[PDB]
Paper text:
[name]–[name] (complex 2) crystallized in the monoclinic C121 space group and crystals diffracted at 3.4 Å resolution. Complex 2 contains three hetero-dimers in the asymmetric unit. The refined structure consists of residues 2–231 for [name] (chains A, B and C) and residues 9–166 for [name] (chains D, E and F). The three hetero-dimers are structurally identical with a RMSD of 0.167 Å and 0.140 Å for superimposed Cα-positions. In complex 1 the helices of [name]-A are oriented perpendicularly to the barrel axis of [name], whereas, for complex 2, the helices of [name] are parallel with the barrel axis. Although the size of [name] is two times smaller than for [name]-A, its interaction surface with [name] is larger by 375 Å2. The interaction surface between [name] and [name] is quite different from that of complex 1: [name] has less repeats than [name]-A and almost all of its diversified residues are involved in the interaction: 23 out of 24 randomized residues are located in the interface and 21 out of 24 randomized residues are involving in contacts with [name] from chains D, E, F respectively. Unlike previously observed for the four other αRep structure complexes already solved, the not randomized C-cap module is also involved in the interaction. The favourable enthalpic contribution reflects the important involvement of hydrogen bonds in this interaction, as corroborated by the structure: the [name]–[name] complex involves 165, 154 and 156 contacts with 9, 9 and 8 direct H-bonds for A:D, B:E and C:F heterodimers respectively.
A family of artificial proteins, named αRep, based on a natural family of helical repeat was previously designed. αRep members are efficiently expressed, folded and extremely stable proteins. A large αRep library was constructed creating proteins with a randomized interaction surface. From this library, we selected by phage display αRep binders with nanomolar dissociation constants against the [name]. The structures of two independent αRep binders in complex with the [name] target were solved by X-ray crystallography revealing two totally different binding modes.
Author numbering:
A (entry chain D): 9 to 166
B (entry chain A): 2 to 64, 68 to 231
Write the structure that this text describes.
């Protein structure tokens, strides 16, 4: 598909603007736009001094769906801020990489509920056998929120 | 689906809300029209009870997802349309980061041939010098993704998302939305694989209207599945 290079430049630049609302908007923008040139800059936005900015940059990388950002996202799951680590989960379920199956299953056990909920979807999205596998094991090794999820997938998915 | 046939052109819309936030009673009502062919929603909502105790954005989400533009290949996943015209029930719980929380119950259905949303809101724990009760929020909205996932156990969907409300001279007040929808009638409905929706909303103000109001321009368009 086609990406307006004028805006692409602008927004990747704006990613290092003094104002945070600016660089927050640049994240959302570049996610929708979906250009490969924004992936690298967005992983470096993933370490942004501001949390809300880190946060978008995450889902932004999810939207763009490039397999490059899988690892940095997995590391971003461990972010201090929970909201950021939630959107990182969601992002990883979008990309659909199997490499996020474990770190997501680990997040089903996260302290914050939204982050537990995010992962749930994300895994549900990725699916297939390597998910179906870890789910069947979790119906026994798991407990509480996480356990409730495992059974629900094995209910729905084959 | 039989529901989707209804939304083929432009369909008029109506919304009514009764709310109570930390005691502050109020009610909102709105009128407009929606072309699911473009995912477009265009409406005007007004506080009937004079002044609104909260900032308009909070209520956006609670105050129709049947007008969502589902692509051709994903047409099997529009639970909302499928549930019509009998309609569906949208129950939410909205935790504001470092502030209070809402509980809502909406009844979204077709009346004659107008889409109608009837909501019943309950707010608690909201800080008085909070952003909500302190009206510290900008008059605009962001693009968000609404994460959808079927509920085999019940017979509908668990929806979840995290709204980002801009502060006037500040960052962002978050809002974890925990949603759940369920059908009104007993008809058969589509239950979808995990996908999401991509929203674009615009807030504006009519100069001629003197009441407490909001002018909304939405564009929900579904994404996720691939074929």
């Amino acid at each position: 598909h086609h990406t307006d290079p004028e805006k692409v430049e602008m927004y990747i630049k704006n990613l290092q603007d003094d104002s945070m609302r600016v660089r927050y908007n640049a994240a959302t923008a570049l996610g929708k736009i979906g250009d490969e040139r924004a992936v690298e800059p967005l992983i470096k936005a993933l370490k942004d001094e501001d949390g809300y900015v880190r946060l978008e940059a995450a889902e932004a990388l999810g939207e763009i769906g490039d397999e490059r950002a899988v690892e940095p996202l997995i590391k971003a799951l461990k972010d201090e801020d929970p909201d950021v680590r939630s959107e990182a989960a969601l992002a990883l379920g979008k990309i659909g990489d199997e490499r996020a199956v474990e770190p997501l299953i680990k997040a089903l056990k996260d302290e914050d509920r939204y982050v537990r909920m995010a992962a749930a979807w994300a895994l549900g999205k990725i699916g297939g056998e390597r998910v179906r596998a870890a789910m069947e094991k979790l119906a026994e090794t798991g407990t509480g929120f996480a356990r409730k999820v495992a059974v629900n997938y094995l209910e729905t998915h084959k | 689906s039989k529901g989707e046939e209804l939304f083929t052109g432009v369909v008029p819309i109506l919304v009514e809300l009764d709310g109570d936030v930390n005691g502050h009673k109020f009610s909102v009502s709105g009128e407009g029209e929606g072309d699911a062919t473009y995912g477009k929603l265009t409406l005007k909502f007004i506080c009937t009870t004079g002044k609104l105790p909260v900032p308009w954005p909070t209520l956006v989400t609670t105050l129709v997802q049947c007008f969502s533009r589902y692509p051709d290949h994903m047409k099997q996943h529009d639970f909302f349309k499928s549930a019509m015209p009998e309609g569906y029930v949208q129950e939410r719980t909205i935790f504001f980061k470092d502030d209070g929380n809402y509980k809502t119950r909406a009844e979204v259905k077709f009346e004659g041939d107008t889409l109608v949303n009837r909501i019943e809101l309950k707010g608690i724990d909201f800080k008085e010098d909070g952003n909500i009760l302190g009206h510290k929020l900008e008059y605009n909205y962001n693009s968000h993704n609404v994460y959808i996932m079927a509920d085999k156990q019940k017979n509908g969907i668990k929806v979840n998302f995290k709204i980002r409300h801009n502060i006037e001279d500040g960052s962002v007040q978050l809002a974890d939305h925990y949603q759940q929808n369920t059908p009104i009638g007993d008809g058969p409905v589509l239950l979808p694989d995990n996908h999401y929706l991509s929203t674009q909303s615009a807030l504006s103000k009519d100069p001629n209207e003197k009441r407490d109001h909001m002018v909304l321009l939405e564009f929900v368009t579904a994404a996720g599945i691939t074929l």
